[PDB]
Design a protein around this ligand. Structure first.
Ligand SMILES: CCCCCCCCCCCCCCCCCC(=O)OC[C@H](COP(=O)([O-])OCC(O)COP(=O)([O-])OC[C@@H](COC(=O)CCCCCCCCCCCCCCCCC)OC(=O)CCCCCCCCCCCCCCCCC)OC(=O)CCCCCCCCCCCCCCCCC
Ligand SMILES: CCCCCCCC/C=C/CCCCCCCCC(=O)O[C@H](COC(=O)CCCCCCC/C=C/CCCCCCCC)CO[C@@H]1O[C@H](CO)[C@H](O)[C@H](O[C@@H]2O[C@H](CO)[C@@H](O)[C@H](O)[C@H]2O)[C@H]1O
Ligand code: BCL
Ligand code: BCL
Ligand code: BCL
Ligand SMILES: CC[C@H]1c2cc3[nH]c4c(c3C)C(=O)[C@H](C(=O)OC)c4c3nc(cc4[nH]c(cc(n2)[C@@H]1C)c(C(C)=O)c4C)[C@@H](C)[C@@H]3CCC(=O)OC/C=C(\C)CCC[C@H](C)CCC[C@H](C)CCCC(C)C
Ligand SMILES: COC1=C(OC)C(=O)C(C/C=C(\C)CC/C=C(\C)CC/C=C(\C)CC/C=C(\C)CC/C=C(\C)CC/C=C(\C)CC/C=C(\C)CC/C=C(\C)CC/C=C(\C)CCC=C(C)C)=C(C)C1=O
Ligand SMILES: CCCCCCCCCCCCCCCCCC(=O)OC[C@H](COP(=O)([O-])OCC[N+](C)(C)C)OC(=O)CCCCCCCCCCCCCCCCC
Ligand SMILES: COC(C)(C)C/C=C/C(C)=C/C=C/C(C)=C/C=C/C(C)=C/C=C\C=C(C)\C=C\C=C(/C)CC/C=C(\C)CCC=C(C)C
Ligand SMILES: CCCCCCCCCCCC[N+](C)(C)[O-]
Ligand SMILES: CCCCCCCCCCCC[N+](C)(C)[O-]
Ligand SMILES: CCCCCCCCCCCC[N+](C)(C)[O-]
Ligand SMILES: [Fe+3]
Ligand SMILES: [K+]
Ligand SMILES: [Mg+2]
Lengths: 302, 281, 240
């Protein structure tokens, strides 16, 4: 009989919402996209507008170049044959230079040079995109939490593809661009370093990852459960606590003996999440640079 | 002691069992019938884990481990020192978890909120039961379950996985991981957005949901909204766990070879199986 | 050993982090109180954080937290025992008194404003040009309570302008006045709207709003509190 707020029962639409202006250069917003009723059962129906600008174009272009550089090598591996391309789509792989070439940019296209090219395009696309997350907050007068959080992800990615290869002296230590091949890289990395389950930073990463699923199931469910008192209007519950915020706190206090605020829960959140890649990148960066075998290291409980 | 706004909510009511008999708090904790059940099951279980530590003969927390009956016992009982304790402790654990959920339900009732939290918790319980009850029973032995020990259960994860090669190729595992990773991305963004609106640049007024919508649209062309993101977080994390359980419930039951080899269905399709070139011709 | 140093440092960092987080989450509700209002003796090992100040938009002021904590309302409950830890029995009608799961908080008796300073929530009729875009339009449908009697009819939907979502149904009663029902506590069906939380006699008891085209935070809490309170307190008149 009772309703659950997982999907809306009634959608309502008004004029396309063009957004707050603050210090944003409006010359760079698109106009609105379509409205999707399908999206609208779960979240907002409105696609767009989006902001371009120079950095956006750079990122987007640069990111496509990465993607098409990887895809040109795949068609090539397929001898230009479409049926073979789909077939072996997950088996293709753009691999980095062999160890002989070390950190040099001298390796031929077909044996690493293409990987460096694609890696270059990716490096540009991500960092431009990072700067994008800062700049769009700045235009709107908002805190920089999103760019600080994104930087945690970037740290792991940087460690895997750039920082660890340099410290180990060779690009051959980096991750290849392919679906199956990256999983093989991953497995092989654990095996070669004595099993990552013995790397305390790996185990922390995990705790945070599983922790994030805890916390978002918890938080997400809490807000849904008090959404009949307006719980999802979190910024106003912060400025002016209502029964939604109090019943939320109290559910948890009565369940496990302590509890959050409508603001502080989001600090638990930002941190649980960022600590995944944060501890994680330390774990990898140390692997092979400083510890050759986590089993061994672990036996000297240290 | 009470939070400053708590008294008005501490009324009688909402119990599922016992009426007013266990309708009270102890400090901050609500009790209830299911609070008593939880205590019993957890206390029994801890006592027994400690007893098991005495038979294994250690008190180190990094060494205590309680293993299930060996495979030769099938689905029967085993003497307490050779898997039976694990068996009793698993009943306690299940008792304690389910009680914890039903007590959460009682708290919801008192507080006049939705049942989403314990409903969500129930997915974690279903994963635990997949590994310690459902999957072992379909495989014919308690011994396919994981042992209760900090480092030993990790040993079991590695051995179980490598029995099927790289477990990476279990396709339900791939999906699960996708949801775990996506969930964490979402958590990072959500926490960061709300905090960026409530804590703006020095001197400025608090931003609004309008700014949060505007921010995401600026960055990626879409905002899912303040209701939607809570709907999303719930879904991503539950979907991760549902697919976790699915990836294990099928492993050793309907699929039991190297998971890598499963993918050959695709490669071996008539339309392109025999065309040469590529990785597989 | 570098990895040893890194891990020891992290555990230290993590402990500071838990302290920062725990204390930040003590900016409401603390200090702890006895069942009578007065500061409890044992506050715990975590001290209150130094205050912080939110600047509210639209001239609405600041909030500074932690700060002095009061309910700013009568609480119609009384003790049912001689020691800490039991329930507190309603002294009147808990629906009418707004206690228990009928509770409301004394929020600011103005309406939440969008980022332009306009009321966030309007009846759809006054919100240009918002309309139902999908699903069954409830407007026109008779409203049914948990006793299975018609308590009224839906005459509008109150919508959140900037998030473009339904938030209440405005319902007209036998006497011709209206009430807001939270969107989240109705099942819209094809021939009716169903409300499990309230019997048909309890609709009139829903708190009413002072102006007919806006709703304040205070009124929202009274409405939502009252309707949810129904689950516990209208469960005698419900029904199989
Ligand atoms: C090594 C790895 C390398 C990888 C690098 C990746 C870095 C990833 C960082 C992710 C941060 C996300 C968190 C967002 C946040 O809350 O702060 C926003 C914050 C700025 O906020 P904003 O949005 O611009 O401002 C609007 C508001 O007014 C202000 O916003 P607000 O209201 O949110 O501001 C509050 C904030 C203030 O903001 C900050 O400045 C944060 C500084 C970060 C710390 C961190 C990295 C941890 C690595 C682990 C170390 C050991 C590993 C080995 O306070 C905190 O949250 C930090 C508290 C944690 C301290 C606990 C540790 C103390 C140890 C005590 C031990 C006790 C012993 C027990 C026995 O971000 C930063 O400051 C980062 C930039 C740092 C500048 C570089 C300095 C060069 C010298
Ligand atoms: C992840 C990280 C999580 C960080 C947790 C941070 C904890 C924050 C504590 C906040 C303190 C706080 O303010 O909330 C308190 C909760 O304290 C607990 O009871 C116990 C709290 C339970 C905490 C459980 C956590 C244990 C760890 C688990 C594993 C974590 C893995 C990490 C590795 C509220 O509890 C009140 O504050 C006091 C806490 O020191 C005290 O308990 C008090 O005094 C009571 O008077 C009653 C009336 O005579 C009496 O009958 C009762 O028995 C007394 O205890 C309570 O009313
Ligand atoms: C999910 C798939 C695997 C599994 C794979 C892994 C891998 C891989 C890792 C762990 C790790 C952990 N696992 Mg495990 N683990 C499994 C099932 C369990 C179960 C269970 C089903 O009941 C429990 C209680 C644990 C508990 C634990 C912790 C000891 C540790 C950090 C968990 C965490 O932070 O999660 C998120 C949850 C929170 C942050 C909430 C807090 C939960 C606390 C920390 C639980 C304490 C458990 C306590 C020591 C058990 C004693 C119980 C007594 C009755 C008190 N695992 C199953 C078998 N687990 C990490 C580790 O470091 O191992 C040494 C790690 O790398
Ligand atoms: C056999 C394999 C090994 C193993 C080998 C590894 C290796 C190797 C690593 C991990 C890592 C991790 N392992 Mg492990 N791991 C094992 C078993 C496990 C088990 C388990 C058995 O239950 C679990 C739960 C985990 C869990 C984890 C995570 C905690 C951690 C990755 C965190 C993360 O968010 O990465 C995902 C997030 C990122 C990679 C960040 C990327 C961000 C960038 C910027 C995004 C760019 C996007 C790009 C431009 C594309 C754009 C397209 C868009 C559509 C626009 N491992 C076993 C032992 N594991 C990682 C780690 O940190 O180890 C410490 C890692 O390197
Ligand atoms: C070498 C090992 C294999 C591998 C072998 C396995 C095996 C085997 C399993 C997994 C499972 C998982 N793998 Mg794997 N996996 C590998 C590599 C990875 C990598 C990676 C980056 O390489 C990642 C990210 C993952 C991720 C995952 C997840 C999909 C899943 C773990 C989460 C889960 O099930 O939660 C579900 C959550 C629970 C079970 C926790 C239940 C909590 C209960 C209900 C409450 C406990 C309360 C506690 C006692 C409280 C203490 C009280 C105090 C107050 C705190 N695997 C490698 C290739 N993987 C597991 C899975 O899917 O399980 C279903 C699984 O069994
Ligand atoms: C710290 C924990 C988690 C985390 C945090 C995190 N990630 C983040 C952020 C944060 C805080 C961001 O702000 C940033 C973001 O913008 O999110 C929306 C981001 C981000 N996280 C992303 C991915 C990501 N995060 C991951 C993980 C994680 N991120 C961790 C789990 C992973 C994993 C698990 O592997 C992935 C894959 C991106 C969505 C974004 C970084 C975007 C970026 O750098 O862009 C460059 C690339 C392109 C612009 C184009 C690529 C090409 C396309 C593949 C194909 C074509 C489609 C195209 C868009 C069509 C255009 C057609 C034209 C002709 C018009
Ligand atoms: C917006 O809203 C929200 C809030 O509030 C405004 C919240 O607080 C929270 C809650 C979230 C937090 C406070 C963040 C911190 C949480 C985590 C990192 C998740 C992990 C939780 C823990 C590590 C704590 C685990 C503790 C437990 C389970 C309790 C300790 C257990 C005992 C002491 C057990 C013994 C038996 C008992 C208590 C039964 C009772 C019976 C008798 C005592 C008799 C969320 C999600 C939220 O979204
Ligand atoms: C990383 C994710 C990157 C997403 C980037 C999408 C780029 C699309 C830009 C194309 C464009 O210019 O369209 C204009 C066209 C219409 O033309 P117009 O609006 O540009 O015309 C402008 C004219 N004036 C200024 C005068 C009014 O339509 C759109 O705006 C559609 C934008 C919607 C894009 C949806 C992206 C969804 C991705 C979110 C989930 C993914 C997670 C990541
Ligand atoms: C349909 O056909 C077309 C042609 C249209 C396009 C099809 C394209 C296809 C099918 C593309 C497929 C792409 C795939 C599968 C990509 C998979 C990528 C994966 C799984 C990546 C995983 C990990 C990547 C990591 C960790 C990379 C890190 C990279 C860096 C840190 C950048 C480092 C930069 C370097 C090394 C260059 C440095 C150079 C200078 C000059 C400083
Ligand atoms: C994550 C975005 C995709 C959303 C797709 C979900 C569609 C399900 C719609 C359910 C229909 C609801 N109902 C019964 C009121 O019509
Ligand atoms: C936001 C903070 C949340 C705190 C969660 C901490 C869980 C710690 C679990 C122990 C991990 C064990 N190991 C092997 C890494 O040492
Ligand atoms: C943020 C929305 C994107 C969801 C991506 C989740 C990753 C899994 C991709 C496979 C689709 C899952 N499912 C259930 C439809 O099969
Ligand atoms: Fe939230
Ligand atoms: K209208
Ligand atoms: Mg959990």
């Amino acid at each position: 009989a009772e309703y659950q707020n997982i999907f809306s029962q009634v959608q309502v639409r008004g004029p396309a919402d063009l957004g707050m202006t603050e210090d944003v250069n409006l010359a760079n917003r698109s106009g609105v996209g379509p409205f999707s009723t399908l999206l609208g059962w779960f979240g907002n129906a409105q696609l767009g507008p989006i902001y371009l600008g120079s950095l956006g174009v750079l990122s987007l272009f640069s990111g496509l170049m990465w993607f098409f550089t990887i895809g040109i090598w795949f068609w090539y591996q397929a001898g230009w044959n479409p049926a073979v391309f789909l077939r072996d789509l997950f088996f293709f792989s753009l691999e980095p230079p062999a160890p002989e070439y070390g950190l040099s940019f001298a390796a031929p296209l077909k044996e690493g040079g293409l990987w460096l090219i694609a890696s270059f395009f990716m490096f540009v696309a991500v960092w431009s995109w990072w700067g994008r997350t800062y700049l769009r907050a700045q235009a709107l007068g908002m805190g920089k939490h999103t760019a600080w959080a994104f930087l945690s992800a970037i740290w792991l990615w940087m460690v895997l593809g750039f920082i660890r290869p340099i410290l180990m002296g060779s690009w051959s230590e980096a991750v290849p661009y392919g679906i199956f091949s990256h999983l093989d890289w991953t497995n092989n990395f654990s095996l070669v370093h004595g099993n990552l389950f013995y790397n305390p930073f790996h185990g922390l990463s995990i705790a945070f990852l599983y922790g994030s699923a805890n916390l978002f199931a918890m938080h997400g469910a809490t807000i849904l459960a008090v959404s009949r008192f307006g719980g999802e209007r979190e910024l106003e519950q912060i400025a002016d606590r209502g029964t939604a915020a109090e019943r939320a706190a109290l559910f948890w206090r009565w369940t496990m003996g302590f509890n959050a605020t409508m603001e502080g829960i989001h600090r638990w959140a930002i941190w649980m999440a960022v600590l995944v890649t944060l501890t994680g990148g330390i774990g990898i960066l140390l692997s092979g640079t400083v510890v050759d075998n986590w089993y061994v290291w672990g036996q000297n409980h240290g | 002691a009470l939070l400053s706004f708590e008294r008005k909510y501490r009324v009688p009511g909402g119990t599922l069992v016992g009426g007013n008999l266990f309708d009270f708090w102890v400090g901050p904790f609500y009790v209830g019938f299911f609070g008593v059940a939880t205590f019993f099951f957890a206390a029994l279980g801890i006592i027994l884990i400690a007893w098991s530590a005495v038979l294994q003969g250690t008190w180190n927390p990094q060494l205590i481990s309680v293993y299930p009956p060996a495979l030769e016992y099938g689905l029967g009982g085993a003497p307490l020192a050779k898997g039976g304790l694990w068996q009793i402790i698993t009943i306690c654990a299940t008792g304690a978890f389910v009680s914890w959920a039903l007590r959460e339900v009682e708290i919801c009732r008192k507080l006049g909120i939705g049942y989403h939290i314990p409903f969500a918790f129930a997915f974690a319980i279903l994963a635990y039961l997949t590994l310690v009850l459902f999957r072992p029973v379909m495989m014919g032995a308690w011994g396919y379950a994981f042992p209760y020990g900090i480092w030993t259960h990790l040993d079991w994860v590695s051995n179980t996985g490598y029995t099927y090669g790289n477990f990476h190729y279990n396709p339900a595992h791939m999906i699960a991981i996708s949801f775990f990773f996506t969930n964490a991305l979402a958590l990072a963004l959500h926490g960061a957005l709300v905090l960026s609106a409530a804590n703006p640049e020095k001197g400025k007024e608090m931003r609004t949901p309008d700014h949060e919508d505007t921010f995401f649209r600026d960055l990626v062309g879409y905002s899912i909204g303040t209701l939607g993101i809570h709907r999303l977080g719930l879904l991503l994390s539950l979907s991760a766990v549902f697919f976790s359980a699915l990836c294990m419930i099928i492993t050793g039951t309907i699929w039991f070879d190297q998971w890598v080899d499963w993918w050959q269905w695709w490669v071996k399709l008539p339309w392109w199986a025999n065309i040469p070139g590529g990785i597989n011709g | 050993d570098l990895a040893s140093l890194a891990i020891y440092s992290f555990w230290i960092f993590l402990a500071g982090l838990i302290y920062y987080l725990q204390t930040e989450n003590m900016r409401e509700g603390y200090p702890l109180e006895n069942e009578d209002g007065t500061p409890a003796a044992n506050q715990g090992p975590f001290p209150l954080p130094k205050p912080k100040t939110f600047i509210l938009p639209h001239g609405r002021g600041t909030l500074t937290v932690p700060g002095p904590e009061s309910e700013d309302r009568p609480i119609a409950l009384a003790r049912t025992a001689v020691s800490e830890g039991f329930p507190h029995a309603p002294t009147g009608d808990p629906m009418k008194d707004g206690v228990g799961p009928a509770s409301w908080v004394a929020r600011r008796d103005l309406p939440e404003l969008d980022g332009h300073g306009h009321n966030k929530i309007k009846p759809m009729k006054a919100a240009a040009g918002f309309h139902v875009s999908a699903g069954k339009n409830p407007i026109g449908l008779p409203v049914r309570g948990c006793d299975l009697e018609i308590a009224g009819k839906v005459v509008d939907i109150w919508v959140d302008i900037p998030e473009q979502m339904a938030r209440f149904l405005e319902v007209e009663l036998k006497d011709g006045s209206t009430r807001l029902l939270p969107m989240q506590m109705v099942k819209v069906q094809s021939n009716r709207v169903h409300v499990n939380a309230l019997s048909s006699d309890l609709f009139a008891g829903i708190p009413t709003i002072k102006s007919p085209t806006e709703v304040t935070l205070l009124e929202e809490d009274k409405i939502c509190g009252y309707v949810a309170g129904g689950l516990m307190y209208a469960a005698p008149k419900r029904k199989s």
